[PDB]
């Protein structure tokens, strides 16, 4: 999981 | 009441899909956004929207794209869908080059700027960051 | 009749103002993949605000972040549905 | 047990759009609150809250238009702004 | 479950913040007719089952005391919470009788990690206040  | 679908076209679906950004920004690639864009395209195409995807758009490109859509004739369109996939911050959406205010994008279709769509639903779906807070969650039952 | 120029917009945001928005590695953002699965499941049955409520539920319940980045582990997300719609929105003439 | 977002299950029903003025009359009250009370009365025991608020949006958008003999403020309109972080349907009667 | 449960002794409390008269040397004109708003709302939510309390002409600090106290009470027996905010406003801010406060500061008191007994339960804010000075000209269909 990673962010925008 | 409900929005009438009694039009020839349910409407257009514009997808703005930004994966790779200007190295001067330092924003990391958004890997997997092509998965999002393809899923959206498939979904809305199956309900009769005419789907157009614009990839890796700069702020100014985005603006010209949407200004063109605004200024088109939608008298036969029941609705408009716009999906925005990029990085973001509080109130802004990143082109590949820098940020722009979201209000600037969406106001192009406001009732007095886009008469072809008055009274029809203008539907935006926005996948972008809106800040840097993190939600820790809370346990419930 | 005159209507407000701001009327009949919907802004379905992936996340709450001020907050990060989450993706999986390469299986899509949480918000967009939940949106697509509820559109697929209900687009011919529910109206748009009912769908986006079930999107909010699916994002709020089925996702939690896994990260080795310090301070980003086990985080949650809820989308933010901003409606200036004045009517129900269905995507099919007859809902089934 | 399960974890949910700390920001979940809020509804922020704003009388107006971000950046815009909000209209009220001296005699009957707020365009928005008056329309809210009317639709809650008609539909509170039958409809889901987001559906109610969409009908409130319709009433405010169609039924009201401003008047002020300071004509830069005259003949204006208003649409409310329903912000939902709700994860379930809200009915006021079981 | 697709529906928030109503299987609680009480459907919950309704706090009304009704601001009519403001500090003169701020230049804010009274909100005449806000008393009919508040009585109308009170009656609507009273008949739905809510326990209604009305707080007139509260300062920012007093609003915080009121809502901080509500947030720290026990709502085990309550299905929901309603909060109606009637005052002047600006973009992102709500006016006490004295000055402005961020709405985020009011609403965040009931965040899930700070208001445990309202976790999983609808928290319903209705906000009558300006959000800026822009005026909507309208458009004929």
Author numbering:
A (entry chain F): 2 to 5
B (entry chain A): 38 to 178
C (entry chain C): 190 to 285
D (entry chain D): 189 to 282
E (entry chain B): 37 to 177
Original authors' sentences:
Caspase (or cysteinyl-aspartate specific proteases) enzymes play important roles in apoptosis and inflammation, and the non-identical but overlapping specificity profiles (that is, cleavage recognition sequence) direct cells to different fates. Although all caspases prefer aspartate at the P1 position of the substrate, the caspase-6 subfamily shows preference for valine at the P4 position, while caspase-3 shows preference for aspartate. Zebrafish have two copies of the caspase-3 gene, called DrCasp-3a and DrCasp-3b. In comparison with human caspases, caspase-3a from zebrafish has relaxed specificity and demonstrates equal selection for either valine or aspartate at the P4 position.
